[PDB]
Amino acid sequence: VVVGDRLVFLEALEKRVYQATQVPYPLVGNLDVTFVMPLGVFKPAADRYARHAGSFAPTPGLPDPRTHPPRAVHFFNKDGVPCHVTFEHAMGTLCHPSF
Amino acid sequence: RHAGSFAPTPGLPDPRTHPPRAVHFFNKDGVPCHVTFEHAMGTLCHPSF
Amino acid sequence: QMLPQVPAGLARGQQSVCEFIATPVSVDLAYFRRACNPRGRAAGEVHGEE
Amino acid sequence: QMLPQVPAGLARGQQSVCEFIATPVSVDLAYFRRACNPRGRAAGEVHGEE
Amino acid sequence: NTLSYALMAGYFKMSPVAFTHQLRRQLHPGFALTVVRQDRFATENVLFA
């Protein structure tokens, strides 16, 4: 093929080599990222505001469970199912003589 | 302009009606970086005043 | 050994592992929106000498 | 000399410098929405003789 | 009134043997944790020599 102003070969070696043998193809690389999410932070008082007037209104006659400090984080899995993290998953670190 | 405001948490005074004392703008990369009065001490606290 | 016992049946790829770094409640939230450093100081090596 | 100490590494371009100018509270806000002159006046040379 | 409950809640010990109660019993201590984890994604590169 020709790209830019150069004439280059273009070869994929799945059929000639590596076909029908246990060795893996060396061009399937592994990217590696790392994620971070805050668990129980509490925004200052000047930033606790409902965007519109009709909030996620609670059941009438019952206290609003939104105005309280949060104690969990809800994120998404690889498939798409939700998976939550809460304080109880930290006992493995905050229950140890190393503390 | 809309009746539905940034309605504060019920039972607390809204921090919107007070006279403001800070700004907020954007950095080069985009991170919010704010300026307030305290930064002016280098100017309003000097015998040149 | 100190190794866990082998799990019975695997659903998706090898399961990751999460840590937990203590942090004062009043920490600013906007610190986590962009790409940040969990340590708190963004030191690294690429930007800043010893 | 009366010089500042060199910082230990920096993350972006050369950090700029901002000043402050006293100004009465009742200054018209609409004066700042367009291109304005911080002096308050419109001195220039391009519109106005001496 | 609520100051009473605030002060009272500000009296739970800070110790592993006490965390194994507070944390499990749905109470927010004066901390804020920062989860970190690492992932890997198998991609398809395109080399050039």
Side-chain angles (χ1 to χ4, degrees):
Chain A
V1 305
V2 55
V3 178
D5 291 330
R6 295 189 163 175
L7 176 87
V8 302
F9 269 85
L10 172 44
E11 299 269 44
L13 302 182
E14 282 314 332
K15 294 278 293 164
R16 333 282 310 280
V17 187
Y18 304 97
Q19 173 80 357
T21 184
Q22 53 253 20
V23 71
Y25 194 70
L27 276 189
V28 176
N30 313 336
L31 191 46
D32 211 323
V33 306
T34 173
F35 299 150
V36 61
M37 51 198 94
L39 184 65
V41 301
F42 185 56
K43 294 174 70 175
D47 283 3
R48 291 197 293 280
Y49 70 99
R51 171 63 189 195
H52 298 263
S55 157
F56 303 159
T59 294
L62 277 83
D64 203 327
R66 293 320 199 283
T67 74
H68 315 322
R71 50 179 58 82
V73 284
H74 287 84
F75 57 84
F76 274 109
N77 197 318
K78 160 180 70 169
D79 299 341
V81 302
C83 292
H84 52 71
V85 171
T86 178
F87 272 105
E88 316 154 38
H89 306 339
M91 278 183 307
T93 316
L94 305 193
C95 297
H96 191 67
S98 62
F99 187 69
Chain B
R1 192 74 289 192
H2 319 283
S5 45
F6 306 151
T9 303
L12 295 172
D14 44 347
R16 288 324 193 284
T17 68
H18 322 313
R21 58 173 71 89
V23 296
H24 291 83
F25 60 93
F26 282 164
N27 203 331
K28 167 173 81 183
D29 304 317
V31 305
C33 186
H34 66 84
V35 168
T36 180
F37 268 104
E38 179 208 355
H39 300 267
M41 289 186 319
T43 290
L44 303 200
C45 321
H46 188 106
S48 87
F49 185 74
Chain C
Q1 300 143 65
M2 214 76 76
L3 285 155
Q5 95 286 3
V6 67
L10 187 53
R12 318 168 181 100
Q14 60 179 13
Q15 316 187 19
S16 43
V17 61
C18 315
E19 269 71 5
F20 290 98
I21 306 180
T23 289
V25 185
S26 91
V27 69
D28 192 306
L29 183 50
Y31 180 86
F32 292 122
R33 295 256 162 75
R34 301 296 170 280
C36 77
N37 186 321
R39 187 160 94 70
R41 277 281 291 264
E45 205 285 333
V46 65
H47 47 66
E49 290 156 60
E50 180 40 46
Chain D
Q1 202 68 92
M2 204 59 68
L3 199 71
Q5 90 286 359
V6 57
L10 73 164
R12 306 157 174 102
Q14 52 157 328
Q15 309 157 0
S16 64
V17 174
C18 78
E19 322 93 320
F20 298 90
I21 300 168
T23 289
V25 184
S26 90
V27 73
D28 208 9
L29 188 46
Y31 175 73
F32 283 117
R33 285 205 164 83
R34 270 82 202 171
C36 47
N37 187 327
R39 198 167 91 76
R41 275 293 281 259
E45 186 276 340
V46 59
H47 44 57
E49 301 156 10
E50 170 51 2
Chain E
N1 163 43
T2 82
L3 194 38
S4 160
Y5 282 101
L7 275 160
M8 166 64 52
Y11 280 136
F12 286 81
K13 294 207 169 195
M14 262 178 45
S15 305
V17 66
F19 277 150
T20 175
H21 294 265
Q22 296 167 21
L23 311 184
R24 184 88 56 76
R25 209 57 164 175
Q26 292 208 3
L27 171 61
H28 176 38
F31 295 165
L33 309 183
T34 313
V35 183
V36 180
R37 78 192 175 188
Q38 166 172 344
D39 294 11
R40 297 165 84 248
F41 303 83
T43 183
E44 292 196 289
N45 308 112
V46 174
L47 193 138
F48 170 85

